[PDB]
């Protein structure tokens, strides 16, 4: 059920806004300008209904865990390999998680979108 | 008896059915994307046994008032912040009022749930 994607985890940075392609592009270029593919942490991203887990490539040790309910934005970068999403870690705290994917990041972004679309809503019939 | 909340009032739209998450999701998408974070009216919601009252946060001007007896459906959206309910607005008409809540819509969803319980208990007499 849960599917895992082989990625380079580029880390997470604080950002100024919860939404925007401008924000995730600037965040990615912060990582790409001072570190190469060799410095990035190879791992897996498991897209579960409630959580995204950044999880090591064979050992299965957790690098980070993000609840889908706090996800505020996601986008593939101007580079088709790069992918990022922003977590609303509170009222003014925003965090941007970044990834590099081979062959590209389209499959991983769609899995995170499906995770954000098929949510359980709380429902109540109040009729007589 | 009351519970009061600081939320954004996204307005109300006519809807096709008295119940439905399909009905409520389409209502929220109509307002979440055709309205911006600044043209959302900051509001004060007063939840009472008989009435839900929606007031402008400062001026306390009336943005809307809904009687609990006509509530037919309640729902939190796919977004945990959003909350909406459907009203019996006419003979065959239906209306959906929508809200955005911080940190989330749980406390507001409970208070409106408590109001419907008082009505459901009032009718069981």
Numbering used by the authors:
A (entry chain A): 539 to 666
B (entry chain C): 539 to 663
Quote the original article.
Fe65 is a multidomain protein including an N-terminal α-helical domain and three protein-protein interaction modules: a WW domain and two consecutive C-terminal phosphotyrosine-binding (PTB) domains. Fe65 determines localization and nuclear signaling of APP and modulates APP processing and Aβ-peptide generation. Most attention has been given to Fe65-PTB2 as it directly interacts with the AICD and thus functionally joins the two proteins. Here we present structural and functional data on Fe65-PTB2 revealing the domain as flexible module forming a homodimer in vitro and ex vivo in the absence of APP.
Unspecific aggregation of Fe65-PTB2 at concentrations in the mg/mL range can be prevented by the addition of glycerol and we subsequently crystallized the domain and solved its crystal structure by molecular replacement at 2.6 Å resolution. Fe65-PTB2 crystallizes as dimer of dimers with a continuous central β-sheet. Dimerization occurs via a structural transition of the C-terminal α-helix α3 within one Fe65-PTB2 subunit (the “complementing” subunit) in respect to the conformation as seen in the previously solved AICD/Fe65-PTB2 complex. The last two helical turns dissolve (starting at L656) and adopt an extended β-conformation that complements the “accommodating” subunit in trans (dimer interface: 585 Å2). The newly formed β-strand (defined here as βct) quasi-symmetrically mediates also the dimer of dimer contact with the tetrameric assembly being stabilized by a disulfide bridge between respective cysteine (C661) residues. In the crystal structure of the Fe65-PTB2 dimer, the induced strand βct with the C661LD sequence directly matches to the AICD strand. Thus, the complementing Fe65-PTB2 mimics the interacting AICD in space and charge. In summary, Fe65-PTB2 dimerization results in a structural change that blocks the AICD binding site either fundamentally in the accommodating subunit or partially in the complementing subunit. The analysis revealed a pronounced positively charged patch (R605, R607, R657, K660 and R665) in the center of the dimer directly located at the transition site of the C-terminal helix. Most strikingly, in the elongated patch next to the dimer interface we find three adjacent sulfate ions.
